[PDB]
Amino acid sequence: ISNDIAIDLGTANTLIYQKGKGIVLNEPSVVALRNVGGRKVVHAVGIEAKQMLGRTPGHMEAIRPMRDGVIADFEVAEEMIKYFIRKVHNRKGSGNPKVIVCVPSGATAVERRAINDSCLNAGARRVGLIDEPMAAAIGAGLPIHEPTGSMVVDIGGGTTEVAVLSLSGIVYSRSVRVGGDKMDEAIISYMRRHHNLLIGETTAERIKKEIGTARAPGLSIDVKGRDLMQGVPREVRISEKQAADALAEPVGQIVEAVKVALEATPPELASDIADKGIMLTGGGALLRGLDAEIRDHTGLPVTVADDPLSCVALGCGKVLEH
Ligand SMILES: Nc1ncnc2c1ncn2[C@@H]1O[C@H](COP(=O)(O)OP(=O)(O)O)[C@@H](O)[C@H]1O
Ligand SMILES: N=C(N)SCc1ccc(Cl)c(Cl)c1
Ligand SMILES: [Mg+2]
Numbered sequence: 001i002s003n004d005i006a007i008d009l010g011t012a013n014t015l016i017y018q019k020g021k022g023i024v025l026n027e028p029s030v031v032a033l034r035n036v037g038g039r040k041v042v043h044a045v046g047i048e049a050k051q052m053l054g055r056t057p058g059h060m061e062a063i064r065p066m067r068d069g070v071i072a073d074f075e076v077a078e079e080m081i082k083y084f085i086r087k088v089h090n091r092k093g094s095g096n097p098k099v100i101v102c103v104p105s106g107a108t109a110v111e112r113r114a115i116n117d118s119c120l121n122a123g124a125r126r127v128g129l130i131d132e133p134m135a136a137a138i139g140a141g142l143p144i145h146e147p148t149g150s151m152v153v154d155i156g157g158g159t160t161e162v163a164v165l166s167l168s169g170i171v172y173s174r175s176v177r178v179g180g181d182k183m184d185e186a187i188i189s190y191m192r193r194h195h196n197l198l199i200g201e202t203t204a205e206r207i208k209k210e211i212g213t214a215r216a217p218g219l220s221i222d223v224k225g226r227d228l229m230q231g232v233p234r235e236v237r238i239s240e241k242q243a244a245d246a247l248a249e250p251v252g253q254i255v256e257a258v259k260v261a262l263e264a265t266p267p268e269l270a271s272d273i274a275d276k277g278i279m280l281t282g283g284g285a286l287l288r289g290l291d292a293e294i295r296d297h298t299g300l301p302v303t304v305a306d307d308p309l310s311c312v313a314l315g316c317g318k319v320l321e322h
Pocket of ligand 2: 008009010011066068069070071101102103104107108111112115132156159
């Protein structure tokens, strides 16, 4: 029994894999803070904190400290990390925990040092950082040890990360701040402007999951929220076609990010990718029809990973075990 862990520190969700056990934590990357005196104290982390989004009293806030793929608040991020690490600790396990944390290509030296330090402050004896797209690829079952290039497109909350890998190494990587959050935000903007209804970010995510799609059909759901002009609560019906229209902008931006990456690919790797095509991972890959949109605009085969939300955690878990 071990306390060694591998951590997917996502913009929206954090997952921990524990050596010998598998994925033992999967919670929103959210911290709720309460004002006391002039100080902010940690009130909740993870599942409860996300439920507080859009629902806080004045003396509280709920924050996503990694929301845009950068560390927005080092102290809150460190509190989040230490909370999750402490939550999975097994008193029956060995000490001197080794901790692997997945790092997106664009993370800065300052951010990497901060994550290292948070892990040490949580009781880690050793901290290893591994490249996140390597983790995503391994978790998606890509044979990244082969010479032939593989492309992974990882659509998360706050970012989409594209990488080309070969022989166990990253050859190209690019990050854009378009992903699941931009999709939610487009649905929010759509509801405001077309239906005069103000909706919360959690409701927007629910709409995206239930009726969202990258391609117009159709079916309909009830959407409740705040009236734009007068403020009274009310509800409207929204269809798949409407949701498609809402999501078209961020979908197009994701497709463009994939095109930009492809365009940077040198000849031999382009040949490789022309054969194998593109692997989608991340929760954004669950958007109905996104694979088809990418295929259509690139002319390349597009596959959706098995269990796209868990690919990175599964991948670094594999690395942890070996
Ligand atoms: N069924 C779904 N359809 C579309 N998007 C989804 C679905 N399920 C989850 N998502 C989105 O995936 C994103 C989370 O992806 P994830 O890979 O966990 O991101 P991160 O690693 O950055 O935390 C969120 O924007 C979430 O709303
Ligand atoms: N994992 C993501 N793709 S976004 C959050 C994030 C940002 C910087 C670092 Cl070092 C880390 Cl470890 C994590
Ligand atoms: Mg991720």
